[PDB]
Design a protein around this ligand. Structure first.
Ligand SMILES: Cc1cc2nc3c(=O)[nH]c(=O)nc-3n(C[C@H](O)[C@H](O)[C@H](O)COP(=O)(O)OP(=O)(O)OC[C@H]3O[C@@H](n4cnc5c(N)ncnc54)[C@H](O)[C@@H]3O)c2cc1C
Ligand SMILES: Cc1cc2nc3c(=O)[nH]c(=O)nc-3n(C[C@H](O)[C@H](O)[C@H](O)COP(=O)(O)OP(=O)(O)OC[C@H]3O[C@@H](n4cnc5c(N)ncnc54)[C@H](O)[C@@H]3O)c2cc1C
Ligand SMILES: NC(=O)C1=CN([C@@H]2O[C@H](COP(=O)(O)OP(=O)(O)OC[C@H]3O[C@@H](n4cnc5c(N)ncnc54)[C@H](O)[C@@H]3O)[C@@H](O)[C@H]2O)C=CC1
Ligand SMILES: NC(=O)C1=CN([C@@H]2O[C@H](COP(=O)(O)OP(=O)(O)OC[C@H]3O[C@@H](n4cnc5c(N)ncnc54)[C@H](O)[C@@H]3O)[C@@H](O)[C@H]2O)C=CC1
Ligand SMILES: [Mg+2]
Ligand SMILES: [Mg+2]
Ligand SMILES: [Mg+2]
Ligand SMILES: [Mg+2]
Ligand SMILES: [Mg+2]
Ligand SMILES: [Mg+2]
Lengths: 472, 472
């Protein structure tokens, strides 16, 4: 009753990739398609360059500029790549299969295709020799009531649209109200929850729009908007040196953002939220904050398809943040499942930088496995010896090299620490750091198209106001 | 019970503009805001550069590139401009008022604003000294059944989005079906009704996408798409010389578009439509054409707010296509209403070219009226003498100067006839004509921002495939 897709007209092993983000796409770019048959399953038909996402809701860059269709990467590959636009709902380790639903499309980027006989919204299972799981993670509310109903995450392209639509609508209503009206004040207030670089960059970009663009035509309205950054810890950007945090904070306050440190949002309602401050002496105070737009940026948690998999594998039952993997990024308790990026946990920070390095490491290992006939064989055997094969052939374990971190702060200021190994090549903040931020980001974009478009967005920004359309 | 906005803290006359299109915006650009107070009512907060609309559904240019916010033009003005984002529902000539509904926003681009006390979705009446009606026209179905339910117009930005979403969705379903499936064939078929430059350019742009971009990754699918152009007359592009029509048609057919001349769509159903051919000898044949995407481009008709006004003015009861105006673009039967663009009819073709010339002419006349105290006065008087005042001060009547016409045909070919007076400076077709088409269109764009963005779209097109996202 359940269709099974199992391509056996090739001697090449079938590598199945879950996702189309940093892990999946970086892997796709490096994997040898002459040696392997690659399929990809993802509900999102494009790669998202997440570091510029915070700059999309206000039109600093356009949404289209920071995404790139999977097919464009796949076209660069010499062999057979297939992309299933669908969601993996169940990983089935013992039969080597992935169950997919919400299938919208299947693209076989190779001349003599085989008709698969799939139908939209018809469930199916896709058979693999090797599985690479990179479905990332999903926004964490920490069980705080109301965040899902009344706030916006900042995680995917639709969030950027949603945020713009909410704020634009609020600006229109507010401007019809007389100055000093408390409801007007509420509609013009934005709360960003989470003082990591995502929340900070989101807050800075909104303040940029308000101060540079909105001010040009509705200056009274612009002057009344109030952005709040709410952070539970005693400092923002706690992954940087404290002096950079301290710079960032003063800068944000200087651009008129209100920064609430040692403060947690305890509850969210439709038009107000409850924030609690734990002061340095142990005393707790409370504040009710009326808000028009709520952006929630407090980190992520494992997706259901992954938590479900925790249960199916004895070695993973104690897993919580993500799949536990060995030195070779092999899922523990599994012979042929690998996991990279945010859906795997090995103590490293959940960043694009880690995902990208994992992917490139994993793809090199696949180059080597293709030179050792035995890896091919153990798939057929009933004994799982692949982890043994790694040590026995002296594959080096994955070693992460932290290259540093960057954060834009609004008003043409950024902080940046650039590293490699024990060496620091750059660490500071300011105007020049902002130009460095731009240049480095441009460098890290995965495609020429997206790189050109972001570059064009920035040039237009030199001369003209940001596009800020409610329905576009 | 109905609020009335009536600004009388100035001695300047209140000029009210309906629309934000070719007529309205061109007028706005030339009207003297030192002599007049200008308000604008339009449900669309941006100007649309219509000649590039056919090239938006497939991402040849982006939707954002060809629109420009009204506020951007208004900011260039020295005096007081106010923009009501709302729809005029009733023109009330005897009380000099316009009734508005669906109010979303009001923007007063001047420092000391007066709180108007308006509310969203609260009806209001806006009082004028002078009314300039430029609300354009709306798509005509000629009463053919089903066109509204099952087809798409190509008239406004949302149409471009709808068309993209339909075709993209069809491409996905079709590709899941085996080659030769008749349903697959249907899903890959597009019918464009109307052989004017709008239908032709739409067809050519779609064929461009299919041949240049889709073919790169799904060549089997691309090869099966079939675009149909259906035109009731015996030639396409009948406003051009027959030899250019003849060149266009051969070119279209050469790019694989099927052109059905002497053929009219008589009925439209969800998955098929009925087309009837009246042959040169008088014989009528019929064909049922299955289709996946239907684009309906057969010209326009008067909007309800305008037809309603026909009834309120004795001199306009016989009006059908639009408001009847005199030599000075004054609505007949009215002392202080003027009409330009497609909502007025004076025998001239309904084009942007005519609308733009009318607007600039009308604005010059307003410069002159401001030097003749009497125009100001007749507003107060009960006798309507403004039309007399025009002749008596020897204002010249409006004289249209046809500058020619242009049409893109797909695959880097265009036709173009450039005129002025009796002189023809250019008339022909081909590759160079296509480069001319681009350069002239860039020249005609009303703002630097939009012009830069279109220019960047074309450059990116030189290197990369068109963006064709279903949900963006
Ligand atoms: C706003 C923002 C800014 C960021 N900035 C930085 C930064 O500046 N520097 C940095 O180092 N990191 C940054 N990050 C973090 C970085 O984006 C993540 O660590 C990175 O995405 C992890 O890569 P991933 O492949 O594991 O997940 P992702 O890149 O999120 O990709 C996951 C993929 O899986 C797909 N998927 C989801 N569910 C399923 C399913 N059930 N079946 C199949 N596929 C599925 C998704 O659609 C997506 O295609 C930022 C994150 C955000 C949200
Ligand atoms: C796809 C396409 C391509 C075209 N290409 C060309 C070309 O290449 N060359 C050429 O010369 N002409 C071209 N035209 C024709 C040209 O666009 C029209 O003749 C022109 O729009 C007429 O100008 P207008 O101001 O009367 O109407 P529009 O420019 O359409 O403006 C009407 C305005 O009124 C607003 N409005 C609608 N209803 C109301 C309401 N009730 N109250 C207040 N405002 C309202 C609309 O939102 C819009 O802003 C093209 C048209 C289309 C659709
Ligand atoms: N923008 C960027 O450059 C980067 C962003 N990231 C993102 O950061 C995440 C990893 O860091 P995390 O610490 O998980 O998130 P984070 O780094 O975005 O910071 C979240 C912050 O929100 C605060 N917070 C949590 N609950 C709160 C509440 N109820 N009220 C107020 N504040 C609250 C926490 O103190 C925490 O510091 C990843 O999921 C990734 O998406 C990761 C790398 C880089
Ligand atoms: N794209 C461009 O360059 C320009 C386009 N226009 C548009 O042209 C319109 C004015 O010219 P029109 O002749 O009214 O429209 P049109 O010039 O766009 O062409 C419509 C054509 O469709 C055909 N048609 C009508 N009903 C049909 C049916 N049931 N089946 C098949 N064919 C049918 C007609 O013969 C007509 O030639 C305006 O609405 C304006 O928007 C105007 C100026 C320039
Ligand atoms: Mg398995
Ligand atoms: Mg939501
Ligand atoms: Mg809200
Ligand atoms: Mg006045
Ligand atoms: Mg329709
Ligand atoms: Mg064809």
């Amino acid at each position: 009753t359940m269709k099974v897709i199992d391509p056996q007209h090739s001697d090449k092993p079938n590598v199945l990739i879950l996702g189309s983000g940093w892990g999946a796409i970086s892997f796709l770019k490096h994997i040898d398609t002459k040696k392997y048959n690659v399929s990809i399953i993802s509900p999102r038909s494009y790669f998202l360059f997440t570091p510029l996402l915070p700059s999309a809701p206000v039109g600093t860059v356009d949404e289209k500029s920071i995404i790139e269709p999977i097919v464009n990467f796949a076209l660069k590959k010499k062999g057979n790549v297939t992309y299933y636009e669908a969601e993996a709902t169940s990983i089935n380790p013992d039969r080597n299969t992935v169950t997919i639903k919400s299938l919208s499309a299947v693209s076989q980027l190779y001349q003599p295709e085989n008709h698969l006989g799939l139908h939209q919204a018809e469930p199916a299972e896709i058979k693999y020799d090797y599985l690479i799981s990179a479905v990332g993670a999903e926004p964490n509310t920490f069980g705080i009531p109301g965040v899902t109903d009344y706030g916006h995450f900042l995680k995917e392209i639709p969030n950027s649209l949603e945020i713009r639509r909410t704020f634009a609508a609020n600006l229109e209503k507010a401007n019809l109200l007389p100055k000093g009206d408390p409801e007007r004040r509420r509609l013009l207030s934005i709360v960003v929850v989470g003082g990591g670089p995502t929340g900070v960059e989101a807050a800075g970009e909104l303040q940029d729009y308000v101060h540079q663009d909105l001010r040009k035509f509705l200056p009274a309205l612009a002057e009344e908007v109030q952005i709040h950054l709410v952070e539970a810890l005693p400092i923002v950007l706690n992954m940087f040196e404290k002096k950079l945090s301290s710079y960032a904070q003063s800068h944000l306050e200087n651009t008129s953002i209100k920064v609430h440190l040692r403060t947690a949002v305890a509850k969210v309602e439709e038009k107000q939220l409850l924030a609690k401050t734990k002061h340095e002496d142990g005393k707790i105070t409370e504040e009710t904050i009326p808000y028009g737009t709520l952006i929630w940026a407090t980190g992520n948690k494992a997706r259901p398809v992954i938590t479900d998999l925790f249960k199916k594998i004895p070695e993973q039952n104690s897993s919580k943040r993500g799949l536990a993997v060995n030195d070779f990024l092999q899922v523990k308790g599994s012979n042929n499942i690998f996991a990279i990026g945010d859906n795997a946990f090995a103590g490293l920070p959940p960043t694009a930088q880690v995902a990208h390095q994992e992917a490139e490491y994993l793809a090199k290992n696949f180059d080597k496995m293709a030179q050792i006939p035995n890896f091919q064989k153990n798939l057929s055997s009933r004994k799982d010896k692949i982890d043994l094969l790694f040590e026995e052939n002296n594959f080096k374990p994955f070693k992460y090299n932290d290259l540093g971190a960057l954060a834009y702060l609004g008003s043409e200021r950024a902080i940046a620490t650039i590293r490699s190994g024990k060496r620091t090549f750059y660490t500071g903040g300011g105007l020049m750091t902002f130009y460095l931020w731009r240049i480095l980001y441009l460098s890290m974009i995965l495609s020429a198209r997206s790189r050109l478009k972001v570059f064009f967005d920035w040039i237009k920004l030199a001369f003209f106001k940001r596009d800020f359309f409610k329905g576009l």
